[PDB]
Design a protein around this ligand. Structure first.
Ligand SMILES: [C]C1=N[C]=C([C][N+]2=C([C@@]([C])(=O)C([O])=O)SC([C][C]OP([O])(=O)OP([O])([O])=O)=C2[C])C([N])=N1
Ligand SMILES: [C]C1=N[C]=C([C][N+]2=C([C@@]([C])(=O)C([O])=O)SC([C][C]OP([O])(=O)OP([O])([O])=O)=C2[C])C([N])=N1
Ligand SMILES: [Mg+2]
Ligand SMILES: [Mg+2]
Lengths: 562, 562
């Protein structure tokens, strides 16, 4: 008949397919964490710090659908803020629960640990409200179940962080268990009928008139869950389909109508021209950040641009506030084939040619590696690429179908990917034990969050950790200060990290040549996700993908401009 | 003639005795960082992450007087916030300079990396305003020197963090170099003459009357720079002098008038009675947090209390807004000996007896270790104790005179001390190469900030890193859940950390018996700060100082109270 508020939270999380919970303990949340162990199928990650935990919750949400991190008042929550900000910026549904002092301790304004010593128990909640879609600070047991529900719903449907503060005393108070028998409503509200019809009719007419329409899938294609619809749209229409860096993975790169990675002026000439020559652009989930776009360098030649977004539509100069793309895309599928029936298929640019055979002793170079990497990938892989050369280079890698890419192009917080790898590996394990998780992280970025490797080991997760050793911050050196000491890093013994963190079942590998790369990555046992691996990749100091060389100059100029 | 705004900043920092600058680079601050190398006597730490950099700037400021951390917009600054908030809570003057997008970039609202994608460039500044004494976001070159000077002054005189945003384009513009020839005013404003005279005269008359006065030194004694005056006051009066956990180190423990560590009901009975039986209490810099006070358990039996504070005075029920203790204490030196001339000295409580001789093979215990540690310490040592058993246990250690203690009793962010150790070691090196820096950090806390050892190594800093291996979060286990899996940690090979981060000149030791403890710590070579050292200390899982056992129960009850 009755259940603790704490246990109710974990029962709800289990109902919405969140099965791993991130964060660190502190006195203000200990009684709440107890409740995790009362719920079958729920686990506590036991993160090495709160920032890493927040990055992990982000990785988990991207793969699983949403996530939860629990921290402690002041010291835990403030540690996590950069992770939460990144989740807000990139539209990732992370529920951040904070164990806060009891109602009675607040009432009496006790000078407790983890406060600013001024009796203000609102300050951290206030700070988090800036990077949250909504917040709740629970003060009474009576409406607490509904507020938990609302927070979980909002996290999921808006795909942005939500803040939920739970006083220590309230987690052990009882609420009706019967509440758990009605599901949380996880569904979008239908669109305005008249506005949605206008948009659909208008698109269909633009489609009928188009001779070279193109589809461009960007971040929100993935973040707001329209990949299936976009795939159908591609198949029914036969229109060329291109993807952005931030949306890479949202469309199948083995589809015969897939045209490549569009990055404005930084695209392959053939890709740039194929996109920009379009007489109708179907833009799915645009997020036009500097790195996503070669510093705002799109040069569409047509006015006929349809922008599909999670919360609104735009057609040419006309805006349709509130009209959600999910339902527009679904309903379009009914009549889009008819609208496209006169289309005569325009050729797409061909895939970048495979690397030519070279001697086994050929030193590894970035351009070669990114082009070679597609050989190692397989359908189902989660492929994570850190801000730095890795994020820029993965744009050149051809993905198998059904690859989930993670690249934090907008927020661009180095170190993110160590934590994201952990969360992705949890979620991937829960989905399918044979799903591989593959990380490319710079030597510089690894340093910020290196301890989260510990948490991978403790749970026997088996990601592939490729560390690009180029002796410092190459991306920065290419922006400004190529020999500046601030761009250099202390030299670590990367392959000793796993055993240092107590790993027992693992492999470590170093590759420095083309021969070594091929030998390792083509190897049958290596391709099985049987244990955690670290691969140290030795690369030259100033070597970078060409797109990064160019973007670095553009970014330098933007910042230096008077 | 003219100097860049960026170089002006570093010239000012040099003038105010800030010679190490903390933080991490990002495109928005790279041109600024260049200017560090243009100023002789200035260096860039090259921190391994921003949170650790903020903890470091905090440790540096505690030893040196104030500090500066530079981060990048969004990703850098938010990472630092837990460090900044602890500095705000514990009154440590840290100048947080953030490299922000150029004026033209903000005006056109470019969708740049490290933004929330909504074109709001004020949001992170807003967030930091909550944990800063003042803020400045520089927009006009003409007033930028004055604004820098204002921020530096405020950081130092108020001993609280200040936020300074510097658009990337502005750092390279010129300002008049002759401004540098007039020093920043770093002095307190004189007190209101009449109010101060009233306070002084009243205290001198209370003094003349008291038969059992005592002096109690707390956190703000050291944080607000009145340690010399307080010591001199003890010497002139010969009144018994006690210290709090947060103030420990502020007064000299090898002084015939030193009475012990007062912690309300957690005190030695002799110490508790000596303080609470007083007929006059001279309280210097009180900060009555839960852990500092045994959960608010002071039981003074007099109302004759003089509270000295940085920004005001209190005498019994009478408050004197704005009367700063610095000048009150200094001027009391003139006539307080005469006022105290009738005082017949009351005996002080005896110091805890030395440990009894025990067999060399006796396994190490916490209580023995804290009571032995005083043998190893020397005058001038910086002694840093992490939240957990270390912070509570260090209360039991006798300090040599002139010991700088660091224990973050109020904010209590585990991991703080790895960074604080770096900051303190930089400062100590600048003050006196022979000054030792000694850390006691738990195995759990080390995990959150472990990478900052890298930065110690790269600069050839030589602290003593004592890591307390008790297989998890013992403090938490004693509060709630002694066998809870959230209180356990992944087991690391601690002694491999130094070589894993590239150390070449170092020692590692393990101690597990009293014999091993004594042989190592009494060793003449060990006692020289000739290289970085890590000492793994093997301790039992549930072993703790008695004061923690008691505090842990009081904390649990406070959180659980309905
Ligand atoms: C958290 C954080 N911090 C800092 C930063 C910066 N960064 C980056 C950028 C781009 O972002 C800018 O600048 O803005 S990048 C970097 C470096 C990295 O390195 P690595 O990892 O090594 O890579 P490569 O390139 O070499 O491969 C930096 C520092 C951020 N972001 N975040
Ligand atoms: C950042 C951060 N996080 C978390 C936390 C919590 N904690 C602590 C306290 C007291 O604070 C509470 O509870 O709140 S403590 C801890 C643990 C530690 O462990 P170690 O280091 O290992 O030590 P010993 O010696 O005791 O064992 C925790 C987790 C904070 N704070 N912060
Ligand atoms: Mg690198
Ligand atoms: Mg421990």
């Amino acid at each position: 008949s009755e259940i603790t508020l704490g246990k109710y939270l974990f029962e709800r999380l289990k109902q919405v397919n969140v099965n791993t919970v991130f964060g660190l303990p502190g006195a203000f949340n200990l009684s709440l964490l107890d409740k995790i162990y009362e719920v079958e199928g729920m686990r506590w990650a036991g993160n090495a710090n709160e920032l890493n935990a927040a990055y992990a919750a982000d990785g988990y949400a991207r793969i699983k659908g949403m996530s939860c991190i629990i921290t402690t008042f002041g010291v835990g929550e403030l540690s996590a803020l950069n992770g939460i900000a990144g989740s807000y910026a990139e539209h990732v549904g992370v529920l951040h629960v904070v164990g806060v002092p009891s109602i009675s301790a607040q009432a009496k304004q006790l000078l407790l640990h983890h406060t600013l010593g001024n009796g203000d128990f609102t300050v951290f909640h206030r700070m988090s409200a800036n990077i949250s879609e909504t917040t709740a600070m629970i003060t009474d047991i009576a409406t607490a179940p509904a507020e938990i529900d609302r927070c979980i719903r909002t996290t999921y449907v808006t795909q942005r962080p939500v803040y939920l503060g739970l006083p220590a005393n309230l987690v052990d108070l009882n609420v009706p268990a019967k509440l758990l028998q009605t599901p949380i409503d996880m569904s979008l509200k239908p669109n305005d009928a008249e506005s949605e019809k206008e948009v659909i009719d208008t698109i269909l007419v633009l489609d009928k008139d188009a001779k070279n329409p193109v589809i461009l899938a960007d971040a929100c294609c993935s973040r707001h869950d329209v990949k299936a619809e976009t795939k159908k749209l591609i198949d029914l229409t036969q229109f060329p389909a291109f993807v952005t860096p931030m949306g890479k993975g949202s469309i199948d790169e083995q589809h015969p109508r897939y045209g490549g990675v569009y990055v404005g002026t930084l695209s392959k000439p053939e890709v740039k021209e194929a996109v920009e020559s379009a007489d109708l652009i179907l833009s799915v989930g645009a997020l036009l950040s500097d790195f996503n776009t070669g510093s705002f360098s799109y040069s569409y030649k047509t006015k006929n641009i349809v922008e599909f977004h999670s919360d609104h539509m735009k057609i040419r100069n006309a805006t349709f506030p509130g009209v959600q793309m999910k339902f527009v895309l679904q309903k379009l599928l009914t009549a889009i084939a008819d609208a496209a029936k006169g289309y005569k298929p325009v050729a797409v640019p061909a895939r970048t040619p495979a690397n030519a055979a070279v001697p086994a002793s050929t030193p590894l170079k970035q351009e070669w590696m990114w082009n070679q990497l597609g050989n190692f990938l397989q359908e189902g892989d989660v492929v994570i690429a850190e801000t730095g050369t890795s994020a820029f280079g993965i744009n050149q890698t051809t993905f198998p179908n059904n690859t989930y890419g993670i690249s934090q192009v907008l927020w661009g917080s180095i170190g993110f990917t160590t934590g994201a790898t952990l969360g992705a590996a949890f979620a991937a394990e829960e989905i399918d034990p044979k799903k591989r998780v593959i990380l490319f992280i710079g030597d510089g970025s690894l340093q910020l969050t290196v301890q989260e490797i510990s948490t991978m080991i403790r749970w026997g997760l088996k990601p592939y950790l490729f560390v690009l050793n180029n002796d410092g911050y190459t991306i920065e050196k290419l922006i400004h200060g190529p020999k500046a000491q601030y761009n250099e890093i202390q030299g670590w013994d990367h392959l000793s990290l796993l055993p240092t963190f107590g790993a027992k079942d693992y492999e470590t590998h170093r590759v420095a040549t083309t021969g070594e790369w091929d030998k390792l990555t083509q190897d049958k046992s290596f391709n099985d996700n049987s244990k955690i691996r670290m691969i140290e990749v030795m690369l030259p100091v100033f070597d970078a993908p060409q797109n990064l060389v160019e973007q670095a100059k553009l970014t330098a100029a933007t910042n230096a401009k008077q």
